[PDB]
Design a protein around this ligand. Structure first.
Ligand SMILES: COCCn1c2c([n+](Cc3cnccn3)c1C)C(=O)c1ccccc1C2=O
Ligand SMILES: COCCn1c2c([n+](Cc3cnccn3)c1C)C(=O)c1ccccc1C2=O
Ligand SMILES: Cn1c(=O)c2c(ncn2C)n(C)c1=O
Ligand SMILES: [Zn+2]
Length: 312
């Protein structure tokens, strides 16, 4: 017999008396010690007093996991631990002032997402995610990346999509005050306003150019004609404009940052472009400075506070 603590969040610890003859799995279920899976292992005397992670297998643990991670998915903790085993071994160099990720396990979409998150104003709601985010900002990004994978249902090594990653993350962010008002104008059907809130207020698919969005983009109408959709009002600290990858040029001073994608879904690679005093292409640990940039851009991020159209 030894005494240990079990936990699902490393915040609320639960005393346990362990029997030395059974494995950890037989008496607790799947169990982790400092990230290492110990389910199959017999207890050691040197384990006394240590903290073990277990799966949320009763109502106290389920509620604690829910409050810390904001999910009820039973597989969450295990997928997070599997990911964390790998992400603790990645390297997080500081590149042009931001925490990046040295390439490994097809992780360029995560590097681009992490770099983007450090340049827009955002607050995550789950305590685990926001805590890991602040550590990632300071340079210890392993937990944040493992959590990103867990929330997106991705495993280490899988190819990822930045727009989809951002959408999952934004679902967990406090964007409830973000508002977008759009107008669609058809010569036959007339005008129709729409109001969008939260994630849908800050994300748009179809054009990369915020300016074009404000002037109007051509979209189809059911009446057979082409209508014009334009941005009437925007309240948010940033917006994200996406479109299928295509040759596009980024002008210094007109955007905050952007994602470039080369390849397809079987095989590809993201790079990150940011606008500072001049343009920088952060490519994992690699850094290239240039005054112009052209490439297959797929997402562009813009600062915003409050915008109202002057179209009549
Ligand atoms: C932070 O405010 C945002 C409002 N909110 C909260 C949640 N969810 C979504 C959700 C996601 N996965 C499963 C079920 N529900 C929203 C939209 C929680 O999960 C939650 C859990 C424990 C204490 C507080 C909260 C909480 O506040
Ligand atoms: C023009 O097709 C629009 C839909 N789409 C997209 C993709 N593909 C496959 C493909 C195959 N060969 C070359 C290029 N793309 C299609 C058909 C992406 O791989 C992709 C990767 C990263 C961000 C967005 C996208 C994206 O939107
Ligand atoms: C620049 N680059 C890469 O660096 C890369 C890649 N696939 C894997 N890597 C690492 N592709 C398609 C690529 O264009
Ligand atoms: Zn019409």
């Amino acid at each position: 017999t030894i005494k240990v603590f079990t936990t699902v969040d490393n915040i609320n610890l639960h005393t346990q008396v362990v029997d030395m003859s059974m494995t950890y799995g037989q008496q607790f279920g799947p169990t982790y010690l400092d990230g290492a899976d110990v389910t199959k292992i017999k207890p050691h005397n040197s384990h006394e007093g240590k903290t073990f992670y277990v799966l949320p297998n009763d109502d106290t643990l389920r509620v604690e996991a829910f409050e810390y991670y904001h999910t009820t998915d039973p597989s969450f903790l295990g997928r997070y631990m599997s990911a964390l085993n790998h992400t603790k071994k990645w390297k997080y160099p500081q590149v042009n002032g931001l925490t990046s990720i040295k390439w490994a396990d097809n992780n360029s979409y995560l590097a681009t997402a992490l770099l983007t998150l450090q340049q827009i104003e955002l607050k995550f709601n789950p305590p685990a995610l926001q805590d890991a985010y602040y550590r990632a900002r300071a340079g210890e990004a392993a937990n944040f990346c493992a959590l990103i994978l867990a929330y997106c249902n991705k495993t280490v090594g899988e190819l990822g999509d930045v727009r989809e990653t951002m959408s999952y993350l934004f679902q967990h962010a406090n964007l409830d005050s973000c508002k977008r008002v759009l107008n669609v104008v058809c010569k036959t059907c007339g005008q129709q306003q729409t109001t969008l809130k939260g994630v849908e207020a800050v994300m748009y698919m179809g054009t990369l150019s915020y300016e074009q969005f404000k002037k109007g983009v051509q979209i189809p109408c059911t009446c057979g004609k082409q209508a014009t959709k334009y941005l009437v009002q925007q309240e948010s600290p940033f917006v994200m404009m996406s479109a299928p990858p295509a040759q596009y040029e980024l002008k210094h001073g007109t955007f905050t940052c952007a994602s470039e994608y080369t390849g397809n879904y079987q095989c590809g690679h993201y790079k990150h472009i940011t606008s500072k005093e001049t343009l920088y292409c952060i490519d994992g640990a690699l850094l290239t400075k240039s005054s112009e940039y052209k490439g297959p851009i797929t997402d562009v991020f813009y600062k915003e506070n409050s915008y109202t159209t002057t179209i009549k």
